[PDB]
Amino acid sequence: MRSYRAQGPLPGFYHYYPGVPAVVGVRVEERVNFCPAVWNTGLSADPPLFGVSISPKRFTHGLLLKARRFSASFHPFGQKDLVHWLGSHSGREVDKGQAPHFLGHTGVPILEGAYAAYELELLEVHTFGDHDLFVGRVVAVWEEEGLLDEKGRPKPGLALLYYGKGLYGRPAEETFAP
Amino acid sequence: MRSYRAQGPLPGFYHYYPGVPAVVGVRVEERVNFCPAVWNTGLSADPPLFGVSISPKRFTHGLLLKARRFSASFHPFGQKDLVHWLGSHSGREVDKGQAPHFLGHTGVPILEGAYAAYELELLEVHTFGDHDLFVGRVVAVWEEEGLLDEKGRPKPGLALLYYGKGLYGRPAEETFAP
Ligand SMILES: Cc1cc2nc3c(=O)[nH]c(=O)nc-3n(C[C@H](O)[C@H](O)[C@H](O)COP(=O)(O)O)c2cc1C
Numbered sequence: 001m002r003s004y005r006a007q008g009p010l011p012g013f014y015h016y017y018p019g020v021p022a023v024v025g026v027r028v029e030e031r032v033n034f035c036p037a038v039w040n041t042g043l044s045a046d047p048p049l050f051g052v053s054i055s056p057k058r059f060t061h062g063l064l065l066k067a068r069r070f071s072a073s074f075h076p077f078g079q080k081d082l083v084h085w086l087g088s089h090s091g092r093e094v095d096k097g098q099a100p101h102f103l104g105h106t107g108v109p110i111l112e113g114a115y116a117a118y119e120l121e122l123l124e125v126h127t128f129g130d131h132d133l134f135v136g137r138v139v140a141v142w143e144e145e146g147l148l149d150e151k152g153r154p155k156p157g158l159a160l161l162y163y164g165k166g167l168y169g170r171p172a173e174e175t176f177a178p
Numbered sequence: 179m180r181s182y183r184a185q186g187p188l189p190g191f192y193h194y195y196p197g198v199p200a201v202v203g204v205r206v207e208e209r210v211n212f213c214p215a216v217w218n219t220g221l222s223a224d225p226p227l228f229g230v231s232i233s234p235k236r237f238t239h240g241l242l243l244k245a246r247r248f249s250a251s252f253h254p255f256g257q258k259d260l261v262h263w264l265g266s267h268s269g270r271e272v273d274k275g276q277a278p279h280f281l282g283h284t285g286v287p288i289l290e291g292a293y294a295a296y297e298l299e300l301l302e303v304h305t306f307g308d309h310d311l312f313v314g315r316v317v318a319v320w321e322e323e324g325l326l327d328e329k330g331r332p333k334p335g336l337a338l339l340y341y342g343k344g345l346y347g348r349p350a351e352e353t354f355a356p
């Protein structure tokens with residue numbers, strides 16, 4: 001097993017991929033923006049907290065600080081092209097608010113087509129190196145009935161997986177219960 | 179699309195699954211322990227920071243605070259049984275240090291069989307609800323050449339995926355580039 005000591009950023013920082021990308025939706029007055037974030041993770045069950053790590057270079061970063069509210073939606077593999085487009089263009093140069101969406105109970109924009117989504121209230125923001133972790137509290141939950149099993153898990157094969165550098169995939173249908 | 183307002187912990191907090199579980203290895207003196215963490219994510223590229231969210235209820239939590247160093251390894255789906263076993267028993271009742279492993283350059287224990295692994299130095303710890311986020315700086319990288327692609331990602335369909343509540347899977351071998 002090859003090894004090397006870190007000497008700065010890694011040549012490729014993708015050893016822990018693939019991951020489901022969370023589409024972050026944010027609205028400031030009339031302006032709506034969306035941006036996928038593969039650096040996301042649950043942070044607490046009670047209370048339910050979910051975090052997304054966003055670079056200060058993204059237009060979304062400033063919008064999140066202004067709105068203090070956002071959505072995190074999870075999309076089927078069938079929307080790979082839309083998700084990639086949203087992650088390859090900036091709100092500084094194109095109105096991504098034209099992507100089909102609706103407003104949640106708290107007013108956050110949710111990209112249409114998701115099998116599930118969270119409406120979040122921003123609790124804290126922490127800087128870790130070149131990205132800021134936005135920690136949100138889940139205040140509302142959206143689910144496309146029939147796409148999640150009895151336990152709330154997205155059915156096998158439906159989720160969009162990101163491998164980094166524009167490469168996507170999906171889970172196999174087969175599962176295992178050790 | 180159905181919706182409801184959060185009224186405490188969610189009936190199911192798995193909407194963002196599946197995810198690759200990071201096997202966290204830690205050593206304090208002679209004692210070695212391992213515990214999978216599906217709540218993990220990259221946090222920075224420059225410098226390379228990686229985080230794992232661990233409940234204070236885990237035996238691993240105390241060990242991390244003492245050692246201030248740990249490993250995060252990523253395993254092929256073929257090791258689903260071992261990973262699940264490590265995440266279904268506590269170091270309070272069983273010595274998980276007997277699981278085949280080796281020590282990295284910094285002395286952290288790395289579970290054998292991984293296609294890739296990081297040796298990390300604990301930088302910061304932040305409490306978010308019922309879990310603490312351990313932010314580590316990558317100081318060494320391990321890779322199993324024959325199991326990775328050109329960019330350091332697990333080969334097609336090799337990654338172990340966790341859906342939550344003891345259910346696992348793997349990626350389809352098909353990849354797409356929009
Ligand atoms: C699948 C995917 C996952 C991504 N993950 C992240 C991420 O976790 N954090 C981030 O800051 N950018 C990420 N990016 C990059 C942003 O989505 C991308 O820079 C986007 O164009 C930013 O849009 P904005 O400037 O309107 O905010 C990701 C891109 C893609 C396609």
Ligand SMILES: Cc1cc2nc3c(=O)[nH]c(=O)nc-3n(C[C@H](O)[C@H](O)[C@H](O)COP(=O)(O)O)c2cc1C
Pocket residue numbers: 199211212213214215216217218231232233235236237238239261262264265266267268269270309340
């Ligand atoms: C696949 C998998 C992923 C898990 N993810 C996490 C996680 O992110 N955070 C956590 O605190 N526990 C997680 N658990 C639970 C711990 O791994 C489990 O409680 C383990 O027995 C703790 O061992 P310890 O007491 O020796 O630390 C996970 C378990 C499994 C099986």
